[PDB]
Every structure is written in structure tokens, then in C-alpha cells.
Amino acid sequence: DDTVAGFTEFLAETGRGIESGNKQLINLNPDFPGLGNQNPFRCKFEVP
């Protein structure tokens, strides 16, 4: 129940967008856009 709740928050966290881990190389380490118009998959990752 710790990991199930923990991973579920992560899926919602990716929906909000994740800041890039290294701004020096923005192409090798890009930031996950989120649920905006830049959504890489045009879908929502949800746990029903």
C-alpha cells in the first residue's frame, strides 16, 4: 500500500510536469512537459 500509493502520486506528478535534471544539456536531459499541449502521449496516465 506504500508503493501503490507512492507510484500513483508519481503518475499524477508526471501530469504536472517534471523539471529537467540538467539544464546545461537540455536535449540529453529534457523536462517532461506534462498534460499541456506538449503532452508527449496526448493521454492521461491514471490508476482507476
Partner: protein, 188 residues
Amino acid sequence: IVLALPIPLIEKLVNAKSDDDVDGGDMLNFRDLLKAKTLHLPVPTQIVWPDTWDDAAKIPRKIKRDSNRQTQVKATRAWNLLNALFYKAGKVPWRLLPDQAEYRTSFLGIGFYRDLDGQQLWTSTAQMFDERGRGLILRGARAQTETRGRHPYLTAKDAEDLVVQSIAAYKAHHRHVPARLVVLKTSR
């Protein structure tokens, strides 16, 4: 389905420390065994360790007991994980852009893997070809043949039955044999 293993379970299954004496050193791999034993299930499964969805989590390495494993940044982990999740959901993320004037080609990769006894050698093959339209098929099959040995290469009959199987799989989607067949192999 995402299998979020807890830290104590990872310690027992992977690092095997909670270890007993070594018997041959061919310890079972939990991930490969789990994937094989649930091949009859209709939904693909994904294994995710806690340190990827939580930067606070730390799992020590198996042999180097005093050091945690180093992972990519959180943004990169989200990119790779969600792309795999999308692919396993039943859709192809991207495809090679095809040249307009190109031969209808089918790619067949051939590889070998040690048997569980550690001595014999089996043949595992993968086939890549783009279906009619915007799509890409990646099949994974094992040569339905009985010629067991330690040779990291195929036999004359074994290769023929393997190529025939790959062609039939291609003909199921295109209804015509490929113009070109490129066979990539891990041995001479």
C-alpha cells in the same frame, strides 16, 4: 500493470541478502521468471523499483553492500518509463520514416541464449517489418526446432525452417512475400 516492488522484497529477490551458500552461481532472475510465468496473462506487466518514482528511496547494491544504485534524473526516468507504459498499452509510439521508393523489406534478428542448465544453447529470433500503412510490427519467437547443442550458430535445416516461419509472419500482414529480407545475426 505496474509492479511496484517494495524495498524489502527487492533485497531478498535481487540482492538475495536478508545470503545462503552459492550453489553453481546460476541464481534465478526474478524479472525473467515472472515475465515467463505470466506470458499467458492478457495484459503486459512492468516492474518499477521505488527509487525511480521517489528520489528519497535508496536500495543498496547486491555485492557493493555499502553503496546505493545511481539512477538517472527524475525527468529522464519519467520519459523512459511512460514511453514503455504507452507501448505496452498497445500502440506504437514512433516509426522510422520510410523512403518513398524503397524495397518492401523484412528484418530478422537472430540471437542465442544459454539454457537454464548453463551448458546448452538455444536460438531466439526477432522480426521487424512495417505493416501496410502507419505501423511497425516487432515479433519475438523461438525457432520451433529440436537440434540441441552448444554451438552458437544454426544448422542448415534449422535456418531454413526459421526463415520460412518469418516469411509466413510477414505474409500474414502484407499478403505478399517481402522484396528484401535482411537477416542480422550475433555470430558469423
